[PDB]
Design a protein around this ligand. Structure first.
Ligand SMILES: CCc1ccc(NS(=O)(=O)O)cc1
Ligand SMILES: [Cl-]
Length: 280
């Protein structure tokens, strides 16, 4: 079972059924997803030479779907290709860059022709480090390996910040930083992330020639996976007679471990779809 498409006119009642008896059926469904993709190895990520390149020793890309750097395991980064609604390498998902891997991160961005980066963690959350600050921070410039990055602009809004960089190897990169998503949790409202996703999707659509969209949080699984699932399902709502949350999360899990990492995130995806449909 790899799919559970729900007619739009039936979604409200479907989600109610899932929610009944303290989420009995929802939990059952989410538990199934936890077995998806589990037959796959992560041998490369486990090589001694790569140990320092992983933020979490237990969050590693599958060998089958990892992103390779050009060029020993100088080819290694903790990142995975993820299909979307539209094509098979629609996203690259990655961990929050480390001080010692941010040059690798930018090399990947360059080599993969990335124009858009989505960041859904803060660098520090409740005093715990989640992500290195890996960009130049005030209209200035810094080297990252063989590349130079320069900030062109920064627009701060209450729930996200959008930055534009030039990268020289001069491509323009947009960086979409959602700043109000607690780790292992969900945003305070469906409205907030729905708007953020629609905004990013608008920019993606306006990015002719772009490679994959990079999406990351801290581990590159929970908040990242929820973002991608919501991006996919919102497109389904706009273009199709049905919506397949289970199928989206299934497909994510085939490609990287733990995608959509808590049950409350899975619930939140349903609440988002329910709220969009109520408004429509
Ligand atoms: C314990 C490793 C771990 C840390 C953080 C997360 N959440 S996140 O993927 O949303 O950053 C998931 C897993
Ligand atoms: Cl890799």
């Amino acid at each position: 079972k790899t799919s559970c498409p729900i007619k739009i006119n039936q979604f409200e009642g479907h989600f109610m059924k899932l929610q009944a008896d303290s989420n009995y059926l929802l939990s059952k469904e989410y538990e199934e997803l936890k077995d998806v993709g589990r037959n796959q190895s992560c041998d490369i990520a486990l090589l001694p030479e790569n140990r320092g390149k992983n933020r979490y020793n237990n969050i590693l890309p599958y060998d089958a779907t990892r992103v390779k750097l050009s060029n020993p395991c100088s080819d290694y980064i903790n990142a995975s290709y993820i299909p979307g609604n539209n094509f098979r390498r629609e996203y690259i998902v990655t961990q929050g860059p480390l001080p010692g891997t941010k040059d690798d991160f930018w090399k990947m961005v360059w080599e993969q022709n990335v124009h858009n980066i989505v960041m859904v963690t803060q660098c520090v959350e409740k005093g715990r480090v989640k992500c290195d600050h890996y960009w130049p921070a005030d209209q200035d410039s810094l080297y990252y390996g063989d590349l130079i990055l320069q900030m062109l602009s920064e627009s701060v809004l209450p729930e996200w910040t959008i930055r534009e960089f030039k990268i020289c190897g001069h491509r323009l990169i947009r960086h979409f930083h959602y700043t109000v998503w607690p780790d292992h949790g969900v945003p305070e409202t469906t409205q907030s992330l729905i708007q953020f996703v629609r905004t990013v999707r608008d920019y993606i659509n306006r990015s002719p020639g772009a490679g994959p969209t990079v999406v990351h949080c801290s581990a590159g699984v929970g908040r990242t996976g929820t973002f991608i699932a919501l991006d996919r399902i919102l497109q389904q709502l706009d273009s199709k007679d049905s919506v397949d949350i289970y199928g989206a999360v299934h497909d994510l899990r085939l490609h990287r471990v733990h995608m959509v990492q808590t049950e409350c995130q899975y619930v939140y995806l349903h609440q988002c779809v329910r709220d969009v449909l109520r408004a429509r």
